[PDB]
Amino acid sequence: SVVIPTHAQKDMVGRGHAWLKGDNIRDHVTRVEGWMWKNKLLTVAVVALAWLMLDSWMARVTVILLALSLGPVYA
Amino acid sequence: SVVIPTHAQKDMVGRGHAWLKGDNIRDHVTRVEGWMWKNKLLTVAVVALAWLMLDSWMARVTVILLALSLGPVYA
Amino acid sequence: SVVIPTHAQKDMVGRGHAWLKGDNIRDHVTRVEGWMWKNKLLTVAVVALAWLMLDSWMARVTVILLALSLGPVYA
Amino acid sequence: TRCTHLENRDFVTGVQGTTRVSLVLELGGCVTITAEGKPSIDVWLEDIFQESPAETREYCLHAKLSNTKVEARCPTTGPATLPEEHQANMVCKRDQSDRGWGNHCGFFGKGSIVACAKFECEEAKKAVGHVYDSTKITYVVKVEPHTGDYQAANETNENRKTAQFTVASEKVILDLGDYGDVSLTCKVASGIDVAQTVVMSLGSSKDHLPSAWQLHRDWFEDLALPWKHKDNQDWNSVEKLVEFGPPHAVKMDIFNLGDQTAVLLKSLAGVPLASVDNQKYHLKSGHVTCDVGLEKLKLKGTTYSMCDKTKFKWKRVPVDSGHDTVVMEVSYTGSDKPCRIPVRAVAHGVPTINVAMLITPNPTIETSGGGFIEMQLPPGDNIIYVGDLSQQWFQKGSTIGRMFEKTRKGLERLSVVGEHAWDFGSVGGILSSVGKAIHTVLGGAFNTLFGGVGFIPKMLLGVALVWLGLNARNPTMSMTFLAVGALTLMMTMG
Amino acid sequence: TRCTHLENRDFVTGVQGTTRVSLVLELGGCVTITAEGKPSIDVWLEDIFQESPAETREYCLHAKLSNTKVEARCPTTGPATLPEEHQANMVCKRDQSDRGWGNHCGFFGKGSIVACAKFECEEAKKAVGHVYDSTKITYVVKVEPHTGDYQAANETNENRKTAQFTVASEKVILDLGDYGDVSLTCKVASGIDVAQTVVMSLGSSKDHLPSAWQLHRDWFEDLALPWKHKDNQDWNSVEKLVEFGPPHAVKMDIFNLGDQTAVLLKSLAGVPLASVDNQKYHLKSGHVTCDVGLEKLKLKGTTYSMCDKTKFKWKRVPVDSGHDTVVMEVSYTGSDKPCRIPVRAVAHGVPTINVAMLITPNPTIETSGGGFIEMQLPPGDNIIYVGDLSQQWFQKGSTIGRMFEKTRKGLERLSVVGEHAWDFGSVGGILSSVGKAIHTVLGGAFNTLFGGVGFIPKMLLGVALVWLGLNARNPTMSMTFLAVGALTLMMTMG
Amino acid sequence: TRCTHLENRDFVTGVQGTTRVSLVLELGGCVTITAEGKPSIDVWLEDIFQESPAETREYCLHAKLSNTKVEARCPTTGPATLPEEHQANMVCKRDQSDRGWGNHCGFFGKGSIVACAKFECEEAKKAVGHVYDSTKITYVVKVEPHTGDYQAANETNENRKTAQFTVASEKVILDLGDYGDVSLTCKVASGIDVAQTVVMSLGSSKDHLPSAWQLHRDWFEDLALPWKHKDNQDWNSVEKLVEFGPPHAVKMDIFNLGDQTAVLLKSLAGVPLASVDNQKYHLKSGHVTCDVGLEKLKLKGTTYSMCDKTKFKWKRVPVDSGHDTVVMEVSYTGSDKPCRIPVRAVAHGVPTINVAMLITPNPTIETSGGGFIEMQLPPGDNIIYVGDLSQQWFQKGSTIGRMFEKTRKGLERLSVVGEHAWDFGSVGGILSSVGKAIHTVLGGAFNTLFGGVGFIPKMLLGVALVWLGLNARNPTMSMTFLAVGALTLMMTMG
Ligand SMILES: *[C@@H]1O[C@H](CO)[C@@H](O[C@@H]2O[C@H](CO)[C@@H](O[C@@H]3O[C@H](CO)[C@@H](O)[C@H](O[C@H]4O[C@H](CO)[C@@H](O)[C@H](O)[C@@H]4O)[C@@H]3O)[C@H](O)[C@H]2NC(C)=O)[C@H](O)[C@H]1NC(C)=O
């Protein structure tokens, strides 16, 4: 029950060594991939429903990406 | 770093004691509240943007909630 | 099964002796002819099929060449 | 006596001529079996345990790195190599470093650098997993009759019986004594799923932590942590806990990511707990379907005369119980001691009708004690008579509240236990069977779609389905989407 | 010379008549100044440090509970009390539990229970922070003239000078020897903001971790961990690291959440590192704006005669450096040691035209040194002459490639510095002033809006803004939102 | 005379007023340079070599397995492990077998089996690669004046002079003796691409194979074979020569794929060969661009007296050489051996106009010998007069045929050398520059698109583009497709 938000302030960054640069992006990508691999049926269902009901490709892709990026973290 | 997926399987539950029942939701709420409190002009700007650029109540609510939910997590 | 891609670069050939000059083409021709001599009925079937199904002469010839070139190297 | 201690309590009624009762026992609950012409008994499942189970994997939560070696080579010169890149329990990384004349290289460019370190795990920081064997997992079921005497939870009852159930047990006869015998003749295949159950534990117990956790095999077999087996010596995936910084000329700092126990605990929210004492690995959340045979039960105290009316006095005055019942204990001042208590109740103003549904069917006062009486009364202002001993009583609640609470108990049992909820108190029917089949199909669909998905995403998916159906142009698709969304919302709360 | 040891390097070229040069010295880069009639010098920022800074709050990352106590009362007997409440370093909780006659309570219902435990922090589990003082922070700037001698990073240079800039120093005038004086005037107010900087350090020795981190005051001060002062003994918010389990009659369990150091390290991704040394707290990232005076510098060996043509040998044949320049060294065995090297270069087929841009002012062989030469050539086939020595050279690249590289470096400087980058190599032009003002305003607005927002949400916001611009009917709002989205996307990627 | 020893010859005619000539010297070629009043010389590139070149990664073609070891565990007894899994030069595999009671397990299911074997490389089976160094690669250029005595290819010529060119060579002047001096200035960068070239050795002498091959670095570094470096000890990717058979209970079979020399040789068709003697690594295909200087040449024997007429005799009568020339050899039998041969030719019918274009400018007899003469007569019926001698000569051909042959040789030079062919015998001009730039652009685009594509697919794509242009009726697209297809078809033929 201890939540520590990430250090998003970047005013102090320069040309020196940084602590695990780009690690959070990799963590997010790995989380999404792991969630997708374990819910292939659900992912296919979401994609098929978006194809069926949404008539715009841009909205289709936005909805798919929102679902995939919003599922795993709020689990 | 190390990514440990949350135990989403509830097939073993019973009437016995559970380890920190429901603290994932409290963590999510704390994270969202903190991010909102630190980012106030941004949230007000989003609210005014959706209000004056959209016509459907559902669209406004969905945009606002998705922004608030996806901001802190993918920081 | 060690597969070693052929050296297709021509950036160094001059006037000196080379290793097995023009042998890949000979091997390709021999392979295609050998396959075509063990599949007489299939080759006749493909030729007559493109004959009957199409009227565009170049379409006939290109289909025949593509079928007879995709046979041995992938079988 | 026992069921009064635990808040989760179910009442089962067996009409005269009934030959057997089907139950779904579960840890943390008690069942009172009331039968016509027979004594009432309390049946409950005490614990589920196995002794000396096999282990699975040993995840390392904290690592210590002993000796670090760094090798660098100049740009034109070949790659850097170490003997340590092919040794057990070594963590290495390859990268490229910028070299030049300052670093004493003949050319300017990117060199080859490799850094290695020795992996070793702290003794007390280690997550060990255990698995259950179907042939050896033991279920302990206890049965006590309603002897008419009250004893607290810290006082042992000499009339309590214990039955341990392995797969080698067909039917267990418990000699309750003067109350006859009771059979149990129940199954172990209906309990937990051993093939998908793992009992994880931590070597450090004095850290104010639970002894063990009741996990799932798939989650425990997919952790991003180093692992091995007890009889093995070489660790696997040693690079999970170690991060390498950017190179600087001929150097590469090796960083340890600390202890991952906190992350593991933060990711375990909601899982059931478990216990370990010595070598017995208990678990505290489970259930098992068990039948009870009432054929041989016997009622004690039907040949006795009747206790005198003018010789009673309260020892505890009646009080509201935790289960909408009245509990008391009387004392008797006569010499004809083994006798029967004349208990009865009436709503104020209706003295000719008895309204007391005794849970202790035939109370007796014996030379060794007795007098505990438990009853259930209708709402209103009643009067509790024990001989000449009156006690005006006002029972709270109402019939509608009772029906709603019974329905809520059914719903909660359905949410917790699952498809076996239709086996509770089942005398054999078609409605129960069809309901069980429907619930099995629905649960299978729900588990294969949203089995490993969180509460909030499931609710959002249900709402999205509802909206799609509501805006759906075709009526059939609208009905389908609304039905599926409502089903998902209903299942999601459980 | 020294600039050659780093992959990052900047060249500032001064035309005749320029006497003051404005620079933005970044900690991690080197600057080479190439004027006409004057020697070249290397100016770089060595370190930013202070000795014995002030303290801030220190947190606890792993606790130690002891002397757990529990007190419970019966449902109607009243609320529970413990003296251990209202005491320092004691974490307590109040809850309610189910009581009854099984627990020796006279009534069935909910009873008050209270639990407490002492709190302590492990000896080496703390996150202490320190704050710099504007009046005591020190900047070290070092100057190294081009004397024609090359030395590796391990060898000390006797021609090198150092200068320390506190607010009491402001202006330091260095004596480079026979190359005259160089004036430096660094304004400390143009460096980092000491108010918003915290140098956090973990007290855990070894553990293969960085010495310290360079944080932001808001993030460090908004943490959800227990805190106190160095001099104090009592912790505040002791309940952040502790959890209480559900009550079980007359006892409730207190749990330790474990070591939160790993979570802290996980949340510090992308933060710059720092150092602590023995007592001096250093920084590895930063910058400072300085003015360099080139009026008193002298050129050594202008009246020297010319070295013999046929006495030059390659000690180190030309090689391509990391900055699109050429570096070589020669030896001379022709007596009359103090003399001038006849170095030049011509493209193949054009022997009448020289294409050499010497970085060394005028290479000269002295009695006990000389020989190193650094020079820049245009793309194509070239010939390098040092006396009668010849060496064919092929310089890769193109004019457009070099222009693209220069603009790329400028963009990187903007992304890493901000509005101070407009003062690099400035001559006080109006364009620089307007660019600086516009950058200040735009960055102020961008940081006010998206100050604490991550990369991905910023990119999504920019995409949403451009979509709103494209879809909006009104031409006025379309241009505004599309331009704002383009600005957001460009500034977020950098 | 050396130009008469091979079928590839070129003639350069330096008109009056020419001081320097630009040539593209190739291995397997010879250039004869003629001028108005200067001796003719033969300039050719003899060799390209480096001594002890650097060694790149090796490859193993044939392995040697031994010490096979297998471990298996029962289905529910954990995985099988070996110490050899974490060792060097071992190939290991993991898979699951079927276990039961005839395998002497306890349960029927999928077990765990692992097989490992030591990996070694046969002594004579490796593919060693080498990389040249631009500063040490040598270009050997020899010059030989037309003395007038014929030495076969297996006879030493005392008048032949050699010049080895490196980056340190600027303008090499060769002393030809009484024929003056000749200056040479060769551009090394115009030669081979050192960075993208590899020399590969293989096998032994008894295998009857070429000493080495001239490969491409990209192809050599992307092979799927085990590799290491000579100074290393552990191989990399040893699993490429080993195939593991399916498991059978407690056994797994490990197989050797065999010797990959045949596959490698079959994959190298079309690449040029090389040579290796002792430690030198020569090349047999290549070129370099040189600039020759003719200003210091002298014509020998101009002060002698003419020979006698009636004292000559044929030694080798005229024979049609392979390059449209006529070669003789006479023998003077007089005491005044140092004299001038009166050579002369007249076309039949006009005995008053000479037609001979002597490539041997001033033939002279001398004590040691002399008498070799080379002509280039016009087509038709001629007569060759050498003193009082006569020999009818019919020179086959015509002027149109000769112009066609010159154009064909220019086109072949474009095919072979490429962009550098425009610098052959060029004084400068604009055509040699615009054409060179156009060829550079076309070659760059063609390499970028079809660099690694074969002859057949390139012809197919050219035909496809031509057909697309023919079919699509849009002007711009049709023209683009037709032009690009024609360029592809023309360029892919060489
Ligand atoms: C289950 O737990 C219950 C409750 O804890 C327990 O009953 C307890 O028994 C002990 C036995 O001593 C009682 O302790 C009493 O405490 C005070 C001490 O001053 C006194 O009441 C008692 O001492 C006096 O008792 C005599 C009469 O009772 C006196 O005449 C004489 O002076 C003695 O000093 C006695 O020590 C305790 O009060 C009860 N608790 C209750 C009743 O709630 C029970 O035994 C446990 N059952 C087990 C362990 O099987």
Ligand SMILES: *[C@@H]1O[C@H](CO)[C@@H](O[C@@H]2O[C@H](CO)[C@@H](O[C@@H]3O[C@H](CO)[C@@H](O)[C@H](O)[C@@H]3O)[C@H](O)[C@H]2NC(C)=O)[C@H](O)[C@H]1NC(C)=O
């Ligand atoms: C170059 O090779 C040629 C042969 O290809 C050599 O000349 C020939 O050598 C043979 C011996 O191998 C000669 O045989 C003897 O030679 C002399 C007369 O020249 C004399 O001793 C004998 O009567 C006998 O013939 C052969 O004649 C000779 N001539 C020819 C045309 O082949 C030649 O020596 C080689 N040159 C060098 C420098 O090695």
